Amino acid sequence: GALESLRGNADLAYILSMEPCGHCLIINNVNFCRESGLRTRTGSNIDCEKLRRRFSSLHFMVEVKGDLTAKKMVLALLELARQDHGALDCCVVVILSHGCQASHLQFPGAVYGTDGCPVSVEKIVNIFNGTSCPSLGGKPKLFFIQASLPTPSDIFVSYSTFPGFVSWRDPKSGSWYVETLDDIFEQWAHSEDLQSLLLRVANAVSVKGIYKQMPCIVSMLRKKLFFKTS
Amino acid sequence: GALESLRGNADLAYILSMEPCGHCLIINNVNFCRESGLRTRTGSNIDCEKLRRRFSSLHFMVEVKGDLTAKKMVLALLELARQDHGALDCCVVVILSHGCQASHLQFPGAVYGTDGCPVSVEKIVNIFNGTSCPSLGGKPKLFFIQASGGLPTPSDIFVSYSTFPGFVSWRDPKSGSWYVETLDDIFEQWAHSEDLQSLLLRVANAVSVKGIYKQMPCIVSMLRKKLFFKTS
């Protein structure tokens, strides 16, 4: 009875009642220009599709964008924020690309464009601020990253691993993070909230191989997020 | 019981068997040099006292060090990391003082020393890394910062950076921090049955509802499990 009385408590949980839930934008970068020096990302496509599928399961509108340049990425993001989220309860943004640690004020890390030009996670998040995007005002804004005064609110960012470090793959079973995220979400998204799920993910992904991969979270959420399912 | 299971699941929750739970250092900068320009964080003595009884009640060997310089803070910290938390289950660091925002590579944030010189959160978190302190390896390492004004793989680190101005009594800048007061109350009511992350969400919501043209505590986590504090 408690679980149903919490999930329904609007002061402790973000009520995800609309159908569909919101937009989910997956940006998939695999092929990098020669000058950058970034190795082709084998398997990123199997990951992409797992996620596309998963968030669809979770009732989102998923659009994928493959191989985009720094300038095109920021253009998709501005486009997304430019939308009318009025009738939506949430918004998701996934970025499957190469990355690194970047100097920041609020949100760490940067992600590479197919052109090798970086984009700060921080710049990505803010594109979704209340001024530029009042439709998502007050609503949870999630950010999933598989890499290497408009006060920011309800911003959630998960990192395949603390920026600067290594994310371990396996072109066939998929990268640990995306695979584990898909699995755990499959298992529990119906009875468990976003932060609990990411705990299982982090813990799970933490027991593989020599080098330990360590999924991150940088949150400014006010309530627990329970994904809609079926 | 669902919660009962949750609490006792070693895979889903950092089990706290020992007693005490660990060390807790609260640095409390109240009086800053005049050149700093930074005002006297009065009322902070009330905040600090509330927090030391809170973490005390949470089973920690709390130690309070007030008015430290950027260097003495780094020293006070360096010390805590030289200890052998080996038999302990978790470590806590609370920092009350003025803070300044600055671009950084690893972690965001910085707190002001009594001298007026900044100490980046990056450096604070790093001081407790696996190497410099294996004693706390794999164990939960908590950092609560309340600062108005704003290959050692990182693991089991948790940083709560609040910058919520606002007193317990708005008419009196010396009544204490509304954030602290609010967090403390939240702990008094749910610690006995809600994990760290859940407690702080309650707090986050209370803050957002309290003020609007104000930010909200930013959390950064590398925890692998839930943390149910010891409460007797």
Author numbering:
A (entry chain A): 140 to 287, 335 to 416
B (entry chain B): 140 to 289, 335 to 416
Authors' description from the paper:
To solve this problem, we mutated the catalytic residue Cys287 to Ser and were able to crystallize this catalytically inactive form of the dimeric caspase-9. The structure was determined at 2.8 Å. First, the dimeric caspase-9 exists as an asymmetric homodimer in an identical manner to the WT caspase-9. Just like the WT caspase-9, there are two molecules of the dimeric caspase-9 in each asymmetric unit, and the crystal packing interaction is identical. Second, despite being an inactive zymogen, the dimeric caspase-9 is nearly identical to the WT caspase-9 for the core structural elements, with a root mean square deviation (RMSD) of 0.4 Å over 380 aligned Cα atoms. The only significant structural difference occurs at the solvent-exposed surface loops L2, L4, L2′, and L4′. Third and most importantly, the conformation of the amino acids surrounding strands β6 and β6′ in the dimeric caspase-9 remains extremely similar or identical to that in the WT caspase-9. Thus we conclude that the impact of the five-residue replacement is naturally absorbed without any significant structural rearrangement, and that the dimeric caspase-9 faithfully mimics the dimerized state of the WT caspase-9.
The essential machinery responsible for the execution of apoptosis is the caspases, a family of closely related cysteine proteases. Caspases comprise two classes: the initiator caspases, such as caspase-8 and -9, and the effector caspases, such as caspases-3 and -7. For example, the autoactivation of caspase-9 is mediated by the assembly of a heptameric complex involving Apaf-1 and cytochrome c, dubbed the apoptosome. Supporting this hypothesis, caspase-9 exists predominantly as a monomer in solution and exhibits a basal level of catalytic activity.
